[PDB]
From Swiss-Prot, chain D:
Enzyme Commission designation: 3.4.25.1
Subunit field text: The 26S proteasome consists of a 20S proteasome core and two 19S regulatory subunits. The 20S proteasome core is composed of 28 subunits that are arranged in four stacked rings, resulting in a barrel-shaped structure. The two end rings are each formed by seven alpha subunits, and the two central rings are each formed by seven beta subunits. The catalytic chamber with the active sites is on the inside of the barrel.
Entry protein name: Proteasome subunit beta type-5
Localization (cell): Cytoplasm; Nucleus
One of the Pfam families matching this protein, by short name: Proteasome
Name of the coding gene: PRE2
Result after altering residue 44 to N: In DOA3-1; decrease in activity
Superkingdom classification of source: Eukaryota
Function of the molecule: The proteasome degrades poly-ubiquitinated proteins in the cytoplasm and in the nucleus. It is essential for the regulated turnover of proteins and for the removal of misfolded proteins. The proteasome is a multicatalytic proteinase complex that is characterized by its ability to cleave peptides with Arg, Phe, Tyr, Leu, and Glu adjacent to the leaving group at neutral or slightly basic pH. It has an ATP-dependent proteolytic activity. This unit is responsible of the chymotrypsin-like activity of the proteasome and is one of the principal target of the proteasome inhibitor bortezomib. This subunit is necessary for chymotryptic activity and degradation of ubiquitinated proteins.
Positions of bortezomib binding: 42
From Swiss-Prot, chain E:
Name by which UniProt lists this protein: Proteasome subunit beta type-2
Subunit description: The 26S proteasome consists of a 20S proteasome core and two 19S regulatory subunits. The 20S proteasome core is composed of 28 subunits that are arranged in four stacked rings, resulting in a barrel-shaped structure. The two end rings are each formed by seven alpha subunits, and the two central rings are each formed by seven beta subunits. The catalytic chamber with the active sites is on the inside of the barrel.
CDD domains xref list: proteasome_beta_type_7 (cd03763)
The keyword Iron-sulfur is assigned to this record: no
UniProt enzyme class: hydrolase
Note: The side chain of Thr-29 acts as a nucleophile, and the N-terminal amino group acts as a proton acceptor. Present with 11400 molecules/cell in log phase SD medium.
Role of this protein: The proteasome degrades poly-ubiquitinated proteins in the cytoplasm and in the nucleus. It is essential for the regulated turnover of proteins and for the removal of misfolded proteins. The proteasome is a multicatalytic proteinase complex that is characterized by its ability to cleave peptides with Arg, Phe, Tyr, Leu, and Glu adjacent to the leaving group at neutral or slightly basic pH. It has an ATP-dependent proteolytic activity.
Family statement: Belongs to the peptidase T1B family.
One matching Pfam family: Pr_beta_C
Taxonomic lineage: Eukaryota, Fungi, Dikarya, Ascomycota, Saccharomycotina
Swiss-Prot record, chain H:
Cited SUPFAM superfamilies: N-terminal nucleophile aminohydrolases (Ntn hydrolases)
InterPro entries in UniProt: Ntn_hydrolases_N, Proteasome_beta_3, Proteasome_bsu_CS, Proteasome_sua/b, Proteasome_suB-type
Molecular function per GO: endopeptidase activator activity
Keywords for this protein: Cytoplasm, Isopeptide bond, Nucleus, Phosphoprotein, Proteasome, Ubl conjugation
Cellular component, GO annotation: cytosol; nucleus; proteasome complex; proteasome core complex, beta-subunit complex
Residues in cross-link Glycyl lysine isopeptide (Lys-Gly) (interchain with G-Cter in ubiquitin): 51
Name the record gives this protein: Proteasome subunit beta type-3
High-level lineage: Eukaryota, Fungi, Dikarya, Ascomycota, Saccharomycotina
GO biological process, one term: proteasome-mediated ubiquitin-dependent protein catabolic process
Function: Non-catalytic component of the proteasome which degrades poly-ubiquitinated proteins in the cytoplasm and in the nucleus. It is essential for the regulated turnover of proteins and for the removal of misfolded proteins. The proteasome is a multicatalytic proteinase complex that is characterized by its ability to cleave peptides with Arg, Phe, Tyr, Leu, and Glu adjacent to the leaving group at neutral or slightly basic pH. It has an ATP-dependent proteolytic activity. This subunit may participate in the trypsin-like activity of the enzyme complex.
Swiss-Prot record, chain I:
Interval of the full protein contained in this chain: 27 to 148 of 148
Domain of life (superkingdom): Eukaryota
Residues forming coiled coils: none
Additional remarks: Present with 2740 molecules/cell in log phase SD medium.
Function description: Short-lived chaperone present in the precursor form of the 20S proteasome and absent in the mature complex. Required for the correct assembly and enzymatic activation of the proteasome. Also prevents premature processing of the PRE2 propeptide.
Gene name of the record: UMP1
Protein name: Proteasome maturation factor UMP1
Family label: Belongs to the POMP/UMP1 family.
Keywords of this entry: Chaperone
GO biological process, alphabetically ordered: DNA damage response; proteasome assembly; ubiquitin-dependent protein catabolic process
Length: 234, 234, 191, 177, 205, 160, 249, 173, 118, 235
């Protein structure tokens, strides 16, 4: 009721101090498909459930690589996912070329966060409606950043975002004491992620096509598995 | 659908421009008659009082150029700027082509200026309408009217402003093609006397000008208007 | 060589210009029809002059279409002068000379104007540019008379070109001739 | 707002005849129908080849129609005129055949001066080719007669080769003889 | 807008093509300004340009350039005085002239002496082309500057009265007609000029 | 300095930067201009992969791109001779060369620099070739770095 | 708990509860008003046809712009507000020719579709960080068909949402419901181009408003040799006659 | 081009003459003579016709000679870096006061507030000296015409405007 | 096309050609944008002295004034723009001489298209 | 969903452009008919008040170039400006390119101008639908196009716009044999006059006819009374 009078734009607080137009953007993630990321000191893994428009269509690209050392997975709005992914890839290229330096994941997270924030104050623009998981390995060690459209970037051992993400997140909370200790086995880490995502499925169980996995770590540059390559993990 | 000039109403008509057309209907009646040997402009001065300078106070008739003049009905403030631009354009044409601007080209330019104001949201429509009168070698004496809507038409004899309908009917009843200027003067005075809301139409209530005979045009000082009014028996 | 000649006579304006000279060519140029009763002959720097002439043609055709009425040769000449001055404001002057011949058809008189490279226009009974100037003037100053008919003007132009072809050490290429009358623009056959 | 703050935060021969146009070179394929021939440095020609081809392709796609030789020639003329005095080394011949204008040849000078013509020659040996062609060339000679005339003139210029032939269907074969 | 540059190329082409460009006028040889006990006196060999009723200026170099820039900045100072509702002071004129002549980088060939009296006191300055400036009790500009400056230095003394100031200024100009303006604190500025038929036709109006 | 390039049956040798996609190029002349061109070309290659789903380049596409890079300054050109070594779409070894104005040509072998006038005939007076004898031929022609490109990838080595 | 008007429908900048961005949702509703367009890819080619949807018999149906060429190897049909389709097609053609100029290779269909979608994405921030160019999303959805030496025959549906899907067979515009439902039943990997044409004609006949005729429907196909080529009225009439003979009885 | 223009004043009358394409123009009772490039004199004629027409329309009054002098000076200072190749000369009589007025300019706009006579253009010094030897103050209009015509003849074809306050006589020599 | 529109821009037409424009009075390149350069330098000075906020406010005010002041019939300059620049009581030649196409490119709609970037 | 151009209606319509089209229908009728080798443009001119200056006004069908003609319907003020932009484009094309404007190119440019003014909410779209007809240069195939405030354009054998479009278009649909269009110029003019008389209550004085012919030939008829007599007597 009264919310209807104050959620017209992201430039107006409600009498309770809430900023509804960005809470809606954060709720936009729930429309997207579930994606899962988990971390170990030697490798970091992403698992994403791809959605297809119809049985005659090819699946969406849930996972994007920005550099040989870092990649990301995203859920939410496609028009905003495109913008943020392109911006992060451009900044990785800028860091690698102009500074001869690999973009540190910690720096990249805040550099993307600063772009995300500006949209939540100026009129005309709207908050990005996409939450994406930056994943990479750098000099400081493995990394996994859950970026939210409110401009919040947080270091997580593992997380899940998208529709029905609560089951995967609860499984990750229940097995954090375990999946961190894998520390060297990529196959077992990807397997653990695969159980984690499997908790989030109501229908359309995992298949060689709808499932997609990525991994990066000490020895492995960011590599994406799909098709027959992921048949062993299902 | 009338708060901004850029909305077509469901009926498909611009309320903000029809309101402007209504505005000029409140201004003092301007009238122009075309004769075989010249044109005559008359206008009933709107704002008047014993203290106002009746001489050197040309409120209705303006000189755009030698062999061209305009009687303006509506907001004189807009009339001043439009007439300034008209003078500048006429002198630009003279400077470029070394020939006095044909009146139709001037009328077309001013009508396009007035229309452009009806089309951009940041500009309200001009609240004036002109009775152009001038002489040029292409068609000799000719007389045009132009509305806030930016359209114009050529008229043998037309009245603009307050109580336009009665004056137009009288002109239609009395006009003849083969008149002389010395008769168009009497016709214009008679029509204004029959159209005025005042009881007498004194010499100070009236403003007058004529283009005749290479072509002289005289904007009448109050003395000759006073003489002429009694000359025709008003 | 680039030479343009113009003679204003009782009923016509005879504009003539030498054919374009270029390696291995066969086929007019140095002339642009601005309207049914006025045409603009030009000479001078290659590229720049033709680019200016086409722009002037475009403007005059735009005016003709806009009003459905023909711009007078006096007005056309004034506009060409004004545009040439505008063009030369920003850049180095480029060698160009223009002869705007036309029949006004409102005063019913033939008028001819020459515009130099600096944008100065002079109404003329006759004119020339380039190597034609010195020799032709020596003849036109004696033979020209405004009462001569168009045929007499053509005879005088033929004499002028006959004189130039002797003065020019090169085997001269001849000149095209165009006439503008009350009946419109025309091109001659024997030149 | 914040955007404001962020800014402050920190020899060739060509002639036209009844059977089309013969192009003899000691050649540029703008289109299956448009046949250019560019003299000058290897850099300018190889770049403005692609640029003019792109322009003509855009025109063809937008208009769904054949681009006239006059239109392409004036496009190139305007382009090189904007660079007049900048140091372009061009001498260019744009030849093509289209029903709207038949066979036509346009030559573009380095300064942008565009000329129509029935015959054109360029190179060191242009004079001999022109002097042998002008003695026998005429509009109503046959396609085989045209090719023989091109052979004689160009082989004479070489003595003192690819022979393109462009028609309504476009340039038909390289004509390497 | 402003000074155009619309025919620089054409004028250069005319100059190389032997079309002699008409020469711009110059404002004479010498200028001298002398500060004295109760005000300042400015003299010139051309005119003494007025910036403000009690702020006057003498211009060396091109006559048009000085008559334009001094006139423009007098217009600026009149607007400023009206704006602040108080008398304008010579330091403002100096600053405005400095910035203006620096903006055009000396292409405006104006060499100026600015003298006046104001609520702060009497002032005397010199402005060269391209903005350089200096201050002093006595000054001289122009071709004949050296002899006039020598006369000033050999005769100038502290507390000399108006008559001596006028005498010294006129003598220095002579050593370089003569017009001098003398301004006193609290009194009107005193301008002292030159102190030392085949056929007939009728046309309409 | 001087640079030399050789094109073989299934390999190429350039006597330098590796830009990926089996593309190795070098520029000789004003060192600053050459280094700037190298950086810009690498940036262009990465942007190519970025916009075009990481599709591998071809020596011809890279050559055209570098032609556009060079010709973008036709009227104030970089004063550097540039050459490329790699494999073409047909699997043949391929070498392309460039000049300040942006020329465009393919060559089986070319040398660019002051010593080209001597190196070019020194090879020609005694020069199919397998991978090792192209190296020995370069050694006879000639510290100095050699980058050899083959279907299996790019290998970098250093010699005299 | 009182019924009140809801403002989230207006403006592309407004999220509603649950994060549904409607102005782009309503943009895809304008697609349904457009004429039906069908596309069917196969191992030996891709064929796409369109309902011409002539407003009146006086309109010259032979001069309607439903299918357009972008390059010798790429073509695309369109539906919806053709005013925006012209701008999208102009951008696509410019991008294709620019790529051919800069890289001396045919533009990959995926790259061209990405460029067109990036243009469609401009009602907000662009893919390359470009400032917004238009106040509203395109009311046009066009499917792009082409061939590349690596990907082969492929078909993409480019939406005004800034997203595309590689479709084996896709129908857009009016009657997308039944057309797509029948495509799911009909399409198979062994669908040769000869029967792909007849299948497209069958779909259009099943879903068109009036009797299928060569002057109210047209076809186009992509091939390595032929390239993008619209079928002549005689050719489409022959195909329609073959359909009538074969699918009847 | 470059014909010499000479202006001269008597009692309640001024006379302006030029060598002889007309080089003397009038914008009411104020006469402007322009010696220099043909293109620049034509351009100045057009420009000042434009400016004075606008002035008359806005003021309902013809521009007085001194106001016109200031106008031409300020219009010539524009293009300070591109100056016209012209030495103009203005002559006229104030409608209200009747005082004769003549002034000359440099190409940039410096005004020579002459009291007796003005010359400009090629051979400036010769005709200047001839006028100095020939001129006398407060001449009658016909004597003024004779003096100015004699000055021109000593330096054919020429046009001289003999200007009263209310009527102007234009004569060809 | 990529080529410039030689007609709608007027100014002599195709002549002058672009390459020929590269020969100017030395003071041309400076005064052509003097006001913008001086304001940029002043804004940088404020950014250094008064922090990022002061330039932000100063430029936001000017942008709001410029965006909402559209008057195609005149170029006299908005009254408030003078106050914001502290030009309310000063003159310069750019104000005294503000500085003509008759048939193309002069009408109001060209200015509307320019303003709205439409 | 009709207060701005930028808002889609829930059913996919942009109601503002539809209101602009409704504004088009407010203008007087204008009809065009393609002959086999000629094109006829007809216009219903308003019954002039007895004091209008007939000698100079009005003429509704205006030529954009030597070979192209642009009739219209809707706001006259907007039309006078769209026509001027079309003329400027025609001359600019004749300048930059050698060939005159293709009729299709000119109508596409006009449609772009109309579309461009629809792209932002700050401008009223041109409430006029032009009816461009003519022949391609050095060609003999008649061409006719219509443009709309939405920016849409289409080619028509015979089309009508403006007031009472339905009555005229219905008449044309049942009387124009597209399989064999009228051949003789006067036959096409008779068909056009018949189409207008179905809506124009007044005699020929209210009908304006202009015939465009190949090779840049245009003539505005002033003798339709003869054609009107034949149609009326036959009726």
């Amino acid at each position: 009721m009264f919310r209807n009078n104050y959620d017209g734009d992201t430039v107006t607080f409600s009498p309770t101090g809430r900023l509804f137009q960005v809470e809606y953007a954060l709720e936009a993630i729930k429309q997207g498909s579930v994606t899962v990321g988990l971390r170990s000191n030697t490798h970091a893994v992403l698992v994403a459930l791809k959605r297809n428009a119809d049985e005659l269509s090819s699946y969406q690209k849930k996972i994007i690589k920005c550099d040989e050392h870092m990649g990301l997975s995203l859920a939410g709005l496609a028009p905003d996912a495109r913008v943020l992914s392109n911006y992060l890839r451009q900044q990785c290229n800028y860091s690698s070329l102009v500074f001869n330096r690999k973009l540190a994941v910690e720096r990249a997270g805040h550099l993307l966060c600063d772009k995300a924030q500006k949209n939540t104050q100026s009129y005309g623009g709207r908050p990005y409606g996409v939450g994406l998981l930056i994943i990479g390995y750098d000099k400081s060690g493995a990394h996994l950043l859950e970026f939210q459209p409110s401009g919040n970037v947080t270091e997580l051992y593992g997380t899940a975002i998208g529709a029905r993400s609560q089951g995967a997140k609860t499984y990750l909370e229940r097995t954090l004491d375990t999946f961190i200790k894998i520390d060297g086995n990529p196959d077992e880490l990807i397997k653990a992620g695969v159980e984690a995502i499997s908790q989030s499925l109501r229908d359309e169980s995992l298949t060689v096509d709808n499932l997609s996995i990525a991994i990066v770590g000490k020895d492995t540059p960011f590599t994406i598995y799909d098709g027959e390559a992921v048949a062993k993990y299902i | 659908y009338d708060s901004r000039t850029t909305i077509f109403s469901p009926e498909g008509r611009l309320y903000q421009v029809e309101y402007a057309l209504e505005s000029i209907s409140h201004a003092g009646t301007a009238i122009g008659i075309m004769a075989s040997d010249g044109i005559v402009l008359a206008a009933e001065r709107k704002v008047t009082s014993t203290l106002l300078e009746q001489d050197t106070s040309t409120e209705k008739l303006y000189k755009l150029n030698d062999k061209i003049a305009v009687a303006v009905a509506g907001l004189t403030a807009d009339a001043e700027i439009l007439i300034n631009t008209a003078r500048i354009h006429a002198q630009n044409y003279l400077k470029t082509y070394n020939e006095d601007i044909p009146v139709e080209i001037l009328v077309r330019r001013l009508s396009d200026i007035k229309q452009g104001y009806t089309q951009h949201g940041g500009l309200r429509p001009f609240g004036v309408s002109f009775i152009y009168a001038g002489y040029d070698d292409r068609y000799g004496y000719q007389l045009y009217t132009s509305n806030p809507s930016g359209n114009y038409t050529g008229w043998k004899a037309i009245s603009v402003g307050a109580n336009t309908s009665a004056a137009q009917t009288l002109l239609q009843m009395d006009y003849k093609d083969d008149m002389k200027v010395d008769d168009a003067i009497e016709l214009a005075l008679k029509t204004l006397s029959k159209t005025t809301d005042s009881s007498a139409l004194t010499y100070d209530r009236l403003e007058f000008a004529t283009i005749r005979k290479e072509v002289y045009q005289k904007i009448f000082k109050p003395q000759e208007i006073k003489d002429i009014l009694v000359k025709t028996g008003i | 060589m680039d030479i343009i000649l113009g003679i204003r006579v009782q009923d016509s304006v005879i504009l003539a210009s030498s054919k374009a000279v270029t390696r291995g060519i066969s086929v007019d140029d140095k002339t642009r029809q601005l309207s049914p009763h006025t045409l603009m002959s030009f000479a001078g720097e290659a590229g720049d002059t033709v680019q200016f002439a086409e722009y002037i043609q475009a403007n005059i055709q735009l005016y003709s279409i806009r009003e459905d009425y023909e711009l007078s040769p006096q007005a056309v000449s004034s506009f060409v002068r004004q545009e040439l001055a505008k063009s030369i404001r920003s850049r180095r002057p480029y060698q160009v000379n223009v002869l705007i011949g036309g029949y006004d058809k409102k005063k019913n008189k033939p008028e001819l104007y020459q515009i130099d490279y600096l944008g100065t226009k002079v109404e003329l009974p006759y004119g020339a540019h380039g190597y034609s100037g010195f020799y032709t003037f020596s003849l036109l100053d004696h033979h020209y008379r405004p009462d001569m008919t168009t045929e007499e003007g053509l005879d005088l132009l033929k004499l002028c070109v006959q004189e130039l072809e002797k003065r020019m050490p090169m085997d001269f290429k001849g000149v095209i001739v165009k006439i503008v009358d009350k009946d419109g623009i025309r091109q001659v056959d024997d030149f | 707002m914040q955007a404001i703050a962020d800014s402050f935060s920190v020899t060739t021969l060509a002639f036209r005849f009844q059977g089309g146009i013969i192009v003899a070179v000691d050649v540029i394929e703008i289109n299956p129908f448009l046949l250019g021939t560019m003299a000058g440095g290897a850099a300018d020609c190889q770049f403005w080849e692609t640029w003019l081809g792109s322009q003509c392709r855009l025109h063809e796609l937008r208009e769904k129609e054949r681009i006239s030789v006059a239109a392409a020639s004036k496009i190139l003329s305007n382009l090189v005129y904007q660079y007049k005095g900048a140091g372009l080394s061009m001498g260019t011949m744009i030849c093509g055949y289209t029903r709207k204008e038949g066979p036509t040849i346009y030559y573009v000078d380095s300064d942008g001066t565009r000329l129509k013509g029935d015959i054109f020659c360029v190179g060191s040996g242009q004079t001999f080719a022109y002097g042998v062609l002008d003695s026998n060339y005429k509009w109503d000679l046959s396609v085989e007669d045209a090719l023989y005339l091109g052979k004689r003139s160009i082989l004479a210029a070489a003595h003192r080769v690819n022979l393109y032939h462009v028609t309504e269907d476009g340039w038909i074969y390289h004509g390497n003889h | 807008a402003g000074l155009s540059f619309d025919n620089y190329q054409r004028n250069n082409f005319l100059a190389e093509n032997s079309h002699t460009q008409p020469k711009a006028t110059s404002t004479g040889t010498t200028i001298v300004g002398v500060k004295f006990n109760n005000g300042v006196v400015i003299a010139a060999d051309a005119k003494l340009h007025r910036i403000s009723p009690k702020i006057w200026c003498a211009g060396a170099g091109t006559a048009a350039d000085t008559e334009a820039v001094t006139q423009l900045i007098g217009s600026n100072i009149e607007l400023h005085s009206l704006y602040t509702s108080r008398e304008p002071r010579v330091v403002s004129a100096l600053q405005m002239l400095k910035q203006h002549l620096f903006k055009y980088q000396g292409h405006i060939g104006a060499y100026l002496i600015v003298a006046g009296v104001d609520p702060t006191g009497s002032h005397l300055f010199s402005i060269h082309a391209h903005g350089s400036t200096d201050v002093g009790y006595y000054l001289s500009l122009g071709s004949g500057s050296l002899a006039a400056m020598a006369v000033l230095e050999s005769h100038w003394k502290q507390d000399l009265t108006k008559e001596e100031a006028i005498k010294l200024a006129s003598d220095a100009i002579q050593a370089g007609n003569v017009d001098v303006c003398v301004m006193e604190i609290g009194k009107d500025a005193e301008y002292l000029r030159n102190y030392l038929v085949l056929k007939e036709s009728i046309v309409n109006i | 300095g001087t640079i030399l390039g050789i094109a073989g049956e299934d390999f190429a040798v350039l006597a330098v930067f590796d830009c990926g996609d089996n593309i190795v190029m070098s520029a000789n002349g004003f060192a600053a201009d050459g280094d700037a061109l190298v950086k810009r070309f690498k940036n262009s290659v990465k942007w190519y992969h970025f916009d075009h789903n990481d599709k591998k380049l071809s020596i011809n596409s890279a050559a055209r791109n570098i032609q556009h890079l060079l010709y973008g300054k036709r009227f104030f050109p970089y004063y550097v001779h540039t050459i490329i070594a790699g494999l073409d779409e047909d699997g043949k070894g391929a070498v392309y060369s460039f000049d300040p104005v942006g020329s465009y040509e393919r060559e089986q072998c070319r040398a660019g620099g002051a010593a080209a006038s001597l190196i070019m005939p020194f090879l020609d007076n005694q020069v199919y070739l397998s991978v090792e004898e192209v190296i020995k031929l370069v050694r006879d022609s000639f510290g100095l770095e050699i980058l050899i490109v083959t279907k299996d990838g790019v290998r970098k080595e250093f010699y005299e | 708990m009182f019924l009140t008007r809801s403002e989230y429908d207006r403006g592309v900048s407004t999220f509603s509860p649950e994060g549904r961005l409607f102005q782009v949702e309503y943009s895809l509703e304008a697609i349904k008003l457009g004429s039906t367009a069908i596309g069917i890819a196969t191992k030996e080619g891709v064929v796409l046809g369109v309902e011409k949807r002539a407003t009146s018999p006086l309109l010259e149906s032979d001069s309607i712009e439903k299918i357009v060429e972008i390059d010798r190897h790429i073509g695309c049909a369109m539906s919806g507000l053709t005013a925006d389709a012209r701008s999208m097609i102009e951008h696509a053609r410019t991008a294709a020719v620019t790529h051919n100029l800069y890289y001396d290779e045919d533009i990959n269909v995926e790259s061209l579709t990405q460029s067109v979608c990036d243009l469609a994405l401009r009602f907000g921030e662009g893919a390359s960080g470009e400032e917004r160019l238009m106040s509203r999303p395109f009311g046009v959805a066009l499917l792009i068909a082409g061939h590349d030496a690596d990907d082969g025959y492929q078909l993409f549906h480019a939406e005004p949402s800034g997203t595309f899907y590689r479709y084996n067979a896709k129908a857009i515009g009016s009657g997308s419901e039944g057309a797509q439902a029948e495509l799911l039943n009909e399409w198979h990997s062994s669908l040769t181009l000869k029967e792909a044409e007849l299948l497209v004609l069958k779909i259009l006949k099943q879903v068109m408003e009036e009797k299928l005729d060569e002057n109210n429907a047209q076809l186009s196909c992509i091939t390595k040799q032929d390239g993008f080529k619209i079928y002549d009225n005689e050719k489409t009439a022959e195909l329609i006659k073959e359909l009538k003979e074969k699918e009847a009885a | 081009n470059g014909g010499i223009v000479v202006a001269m004043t008597g009692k309640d009358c001024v006379a302006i003459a030029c060598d002889l394409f007309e080089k003397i123009f009038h914008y009411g009772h104020v006469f402007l003579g322009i010696t220099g490039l043909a293109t620049d004199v034509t351009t100045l004629n057009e420009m000042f016709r434009y400016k004075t027409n606008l002035y008359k329309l806005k003021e309902e009054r013809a521009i007085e000679p001194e106001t016109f002098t200031q106008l031409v000076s300020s219009s010539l200072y524009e293009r300070r870096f591109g100056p016209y190749f012209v030495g103009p000369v203005v002559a006229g009589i104030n409608s209200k006061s009747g005082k004769p007025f003549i002034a000359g300019f440099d190409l940039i706009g410096c005004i020579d507030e002459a009291k007796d006579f003005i010359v400009s253009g090629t051979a400036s010094d010769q005709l200047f000296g001839m006028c100095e030897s020939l001129y006398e103050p407060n001449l009658e209009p016909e004597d003024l015409f004779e003096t100015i015509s004699q000055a021109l003849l000593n330096a054919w074809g020429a046009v001289v405007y003999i200007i009263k306050k209310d009527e102007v006589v234009k004569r060809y020599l | 096309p990529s080529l410039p529109d030689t007609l709608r821009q007027q100014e002599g037409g195709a002549v002058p050609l672009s390459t020929q424009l590269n020969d100017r009075h030395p003071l041309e390149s400076t005064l052509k944008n003097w006001e913008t350069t001086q304001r940029q330098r002043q804004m940088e000075q404020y950014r250094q002295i008064f922090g990022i906020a002061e330039p932000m406010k100063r430029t936001m005010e000017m942008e709001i004034v410029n965006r909402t002041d559209f008057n195609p019939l005149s170029t006299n300059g908005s009254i408030h723009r003078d106050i914001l620049l502290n030009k309310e009581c000063s003159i310069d030649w750019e104000d005294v001489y503000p500085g003509a196409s008759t048939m193309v490119g002069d009408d109001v709609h060209s200015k509307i298209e320019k303003q709205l970037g439409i | 969903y009709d207060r701005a151009l930028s808002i889609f209606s829930p059913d996919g319509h942009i109601f503002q452009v539809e209101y602009a089209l409704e504004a088009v229908k407010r203008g007087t009728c204008a009809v065009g008919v393609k002959g086999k080798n000629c094109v006829v443009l007809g216009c219903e001119r308003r019954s002039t008040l007895k004091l209008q200056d007939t000698r100079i006004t009005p003429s509704k069908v205006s030529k954009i170039d030597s070979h192209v003609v642009l009739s219209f319907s809707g706001l006259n003020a907007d039309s006078r400006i769209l026509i001027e932009k079309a003329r400027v484009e025609a001359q600019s094309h004749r300048l930059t390119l050698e060939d005159p404007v293709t009729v299709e190119y000119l109508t596409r440019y006009v449609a772009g101008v109309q579309q461009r003014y629809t792209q932002s909410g700050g401008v009223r779209p041109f409430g006029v639908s032009t009816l461009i007809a003519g022949f391609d240069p050095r060609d003999d195939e008649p061409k006719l196009y219509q443009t709309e405030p939405s920016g849409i354009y289409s080619s028509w054998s015979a089309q009508t716009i403006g007031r009472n479009s339905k009555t005229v278009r219905e008449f044309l649909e049942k009387n124009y044999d597209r399989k064999e269009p009228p051949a003789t110029v006067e036959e096409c003019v008779k068909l056009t006059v018949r189409s207008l008389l179905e809506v124009v209550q007044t005699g020929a004085k209210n009908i304006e006819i202009t015939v465009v012919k190949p090779d840049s030939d245009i003539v505005a008829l002033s003798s339709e009374e003869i054609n009107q007599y034949v149609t009326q007597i036959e009726q």
